[PDB]
Amino acid sequence: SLFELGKMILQETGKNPAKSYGAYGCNCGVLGRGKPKDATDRCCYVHKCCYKKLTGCNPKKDRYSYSWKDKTIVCGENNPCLKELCECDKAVAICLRENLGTYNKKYRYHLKPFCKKADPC
């Protein structure tokens, strides 16, 4: 769910997930995809497509178990969809962290982004 996702983002990235990634480029946020503006944005694009693949579980609401042991996210067995969902969230948080180097606040918006079409997932 958004709870686990936001926690993973904070854990990996050290950033407030909402402030940094809640409205960033074409894909980070709630608006849905666009051609990524940079590496961070690409992370969010992949994450959304990752969400497209799940079977019926609700990525926003469905809670799942994961471990932060030795400061690595380990998705609990849960069940198939939930496990996959967890792996999607883990992958974005890792990705966002890996790309903090080029994170660019100019890509933050109040203001619904200005994006070319995304490729289909």
Add this chain to the structure above:
Amino acid sequence: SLFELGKMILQETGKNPAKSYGAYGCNCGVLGRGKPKDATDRCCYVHKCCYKKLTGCNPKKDRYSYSWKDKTIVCGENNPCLKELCECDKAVAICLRENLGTYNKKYRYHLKPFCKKADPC
């Protein structure tokens, strides 16, 4: 759309919507509902709940017509959903103004990963 909502928030509250309420508490702005931290946050919880009852339209991208007449938000007729979208945004703008007395900056860019599971709407 976020455009009308931001404009209403600014008209009611006199604050920059994005900075003051874009990330406030557990309920305001991008990324989920949680147990409201306070009155302001509760306005946003109610707003998100209101959004859930919306049928034909998207609050984030769908434009709608309202007017500010004698310093009051007046939702156009619109169609059913957009009248209802408009009224959700009007109600949260009013609520946020009504609760400016307890607005708490410390919640302004609250770390949402600290929020705990909210009641269903």
